């Protein structure tokens with residue numbers, strides 16, 4: 001362990017689900033810590049023996065607004081680290097508490113107390129505390145949101161070198177936005193394709209996924225969310241904006257799981273992914289926005305193009321089939337998967353060099369030799385977190401920070417050993433070619449990167 | 460073999476694909492015939508040893524318009540039987556030829572010479588030969604079209620007894636139509652749900668199905684075909700009719716594989732099937748039509764509500780994903796399926812007793828103990844054919860006949876031992892209940908059996 005980071009404090013992880021269990025291995029792999037320096041608090045037990053294998057204390061308790069101050073508060077000392085991988089617990093409340101205790105904090109997503117509140121408010125509510133806390137609190141730092149932000153910056157620089165351009169690594173958001181515009185980026189996709197298959201096959205009455213079934217279901221139930229790029233010359237018939245909501249975002253009536261978009265992945269290529277909504281859509285869009293003051297000049301279109309594992313495809317199909325009524329049973333496929341991989345990455349379109357995709361292609365085989373209690377999907381998420389956790393430790397006083405404010409190279413260099421083959425790929429693909437002729441869909445030959453061409457319109 | 464039918468002639472089967480191979484077992488199971496009394500002609504060989512196991516001659520040859528008269532003609536003697544289970548060969552041409560040779564004939568679907576010609580013309584072209592040939596030629600007599608017609612008549616009678624009504628088994632079409640109307644049948648669905656799963660999982664780049672991948676693909680590519688019932692009070696926005704085409708049919712712009720309809724099956728229940736087009740839609744509709752002369756009085760809505768095996772679901776998904784470009788590879792799942800069943804049947808809606816579903820629920824396990832080279836799907840198709848073949852032998856001089864003109868009880872009693880559990884099921888289900896509320900779809904509370912409520916409208 002020549003790279004084993006020394007840690008004299010303790011790790012308090014609340015929640016022990018899909019993410020939490022998969023994190024365990026990476027913590028003891030990167031830290032020369034004792035199991036006694038780790039404690040877990042969760043509301044529901046588990047049929048898994050992860051905690052027992054590592055010998056980490058596990059407390060069965062439900063965290064509420066009435067007891068979190070005492071239960072969680074009495075567990076954090078100055079310099080401790082609260083790894084938040086729970087659901088239904090106020091990130092805002094936990095963040096403030098950590099600051100008071102002088103403890104570090106991280107999460108893979110901003111969450112409110114268990115009770116439909118917009119994903120916008122939740123972020124602004126906690127973001128409007130930038131200059132209030134001192135201790136570092138890294139938010140929404142998972143594979144995506146999270147790692148994805150670091151992939152965009154990496155790609156932005158690679159495309160620059162491949163264009164002959166030679167500049168300095170940008171610092172502020174404005175410079176990053178400027179580099180995006182100078183490169184002709186009209187649209188950025190978070191293009192992922194999960195090909196993990198399993199055995200035995202799927203059974204009726206259950207939602208099967210490589211990660212939280214409820215997370216996917218909830219996201220697919222909400223209306224399509226899209227960062228509107230300044231190049232867009234067409235307005236979706238079923239689209240609408242919020243006068244007071246985010247100025248950069250546009251929404252669609254239909255549920256995100258009911259909207260398909262044309263994207264691209266290196267391993268399989270052109271495909272139709274679900275335009276599943278996400279948090280880092282508005283944050284990334286604004287991060288790459290440009291203006292002279294109160295007049296926007298540039299802004300790319302940003303949204304998710306997801307294609308889950310075949311089992312999750314069958315699940316969504318069954319979900320709609322049940323009139324959007326979620327199956328009475330959920331299942332996380334881990335050991336049952338026998339083959340496949342997860343291609344998570346970002347697609348930047350617009351530059352003359354051609355569409356560019358930079359990301360991680362991790363197979364289940366490599367993921368299993370790298371760490372237990374992990375599949376291709378989970379491993380990419382915890383790889384990002386363990387990196388973010390290490391970042392916060394050597395930068396404990398940065399206040400509330402988002403992945404966009406973190407140096408991509410630092411994170412990528414730590415996570416890379418956990419992401420299988422990672423790199424960029426150029427392609428001459430566009431949503432305008434390989435088109436069919438059975439049913440001619442109206443297209444805009446003028447600019448292939450128009451949402452009008454990407455969205456799969458039934459009519 | 461106390462029920463082994465004696466046959467002194469020969470069986471000429473052209474084509475040896477999904478259906479043909481699966482038929483072999485049933486022929487030697489129901490006939491005390493010698494293998495020398497069987498001959499097979501097909502264009503493509505096979506990696507299967509079905510012919511070799513039974514010791515039946517196999518001739519590798521492509522049948523064309525220029526050689527069919529000699530190749531096929533020299534193989535048929537008076538009273539012989541040509542089992543047509545090929546593709547791309549003119550049924551009309553084969554039918555006439557058989558008559559000239561005084562040989563019997565049967566097929567599971569009407570086909571033209573290999574070359575997009577409407578399914579309507581093909582039927583009328585051959586149907587306009589009713590009083591021209593003497594020898595019996597049973598057409599479109601597979602599971603569906605075919606067995607399905609016999610299930611409708613069976614259900615029609617069962618609902619009558621369950622209604623207290625006591626009449627005589629109707630003969631002509633008018634009487635059958637009349638019974639349908641007197642029973643309040645507003646809509647009839649061919650509701651099927653294939654749950655056969657497999658191992659190993661599906662691979663990218665291939666269309667996997669329990670039956671012909673190309674058959675499903677072709678059907679899903681054509682526009683939705685629907686028998687318009689007289690009760691329908693709503694007109695689909697994307698619908699249209701053919702002034703000269705079939706008066707009872709209505710079409711939809713979108714491809715059939717792009718239209719979902721709400722139906723019901725006993726084993727799983729309410730589901731969303733693909734409104735895949737078929738042949739027996741127009742024939743059944745007219746068969747249940749009523750009028751005083753030139754003014755229609757009654758006619759139910761008739762269409763298919765199909766839900767293929769999960770692998771075929773993933774296949775269709777990938778098909779659309781490839782812009783309707785069929786995968787470069789096709790695969791028929793037979794031995795790889797490990798569990799599941801095929802629920803093929805008909806749903807009659809409108810009667811006060813409630814929706815009624817009568818059909819066959821055959822599992823892969825029962826199908827394997829019943830016959831080799833068969834899965835749940837194939838077995839239901841060949842069960843119908845072997846029954847139809849037996850029918851034609853004792854009725855060799857009936858001319859061109861359709862399954863609607865055949866006594867359902869005769870067929871059902873022969874096939875029943877091949878269909879697993881077969882029977883009727885009542886249900887209080889309607890496309891109006893168990894509805895969701897996330898996205899309220901406009902419905903007509905006045906009459907749940909309105910196509911307006913059954914078709915899953917995205918908006």
Ligand SMILES: NC(=O)c1ccc[n+]([C@@H]2O[C@H](COP(=O)([O-])OP(=O)(O)OC[C@H]3O[C@@H](n4cnc5c(N)ncnc54)[C@H](O)[C@@H]3O)[C@@H](O)[C@H]2O)c1
Nearest residue numbers: 015016017018019043044063085086108109142143144145
């Ligand atoms: N950025 C990414 O790539 C990414 C990927 C996956 C998940 N996530 C985020 O990670 C999360 C972590 O959850 P997960 O996916 O493992 O879900 P999960 O539902 O599998 O586990 C959540 C755990 O939190 C606990 N929790 C819920 N209520 C609690 C309560 N009252 N008291 C104490 N603990 C409670 C549960 O008991 C459970 O063990 C979510 O917030 C999700 O949005 C981010």
Ligand SMILES: NC(=O)c1ccc[n+]([C@@H]2O[C@H](COP(=O)([O-])OP(=O)(O)OC[C@H]3O[C@@H](n4cnc5c(N)ncnc54)[C@H](O)[C@@H]3O)[C@@H](O)[C@H]2O)c1
Nearest residue numbers: 474475476477478502503522544545567568601602603604
């Ligand atoms: N009613 C039903 O439930 C039902 C179900 C399935 C299939 N069918 C019908 O059955 C059919 C039989 O085909 P299948 O599904 O086995 O398809 P298939 O493609 O698997 O096999 C068809 C066979 O026909 C042969 N054929 C094609 N061209 C030929 C030529 N030029 N000369 C000689 N033979 C030729 C092929 O070589 C092949 O072996 C189709 O017509 C289909 O519509 C009906």
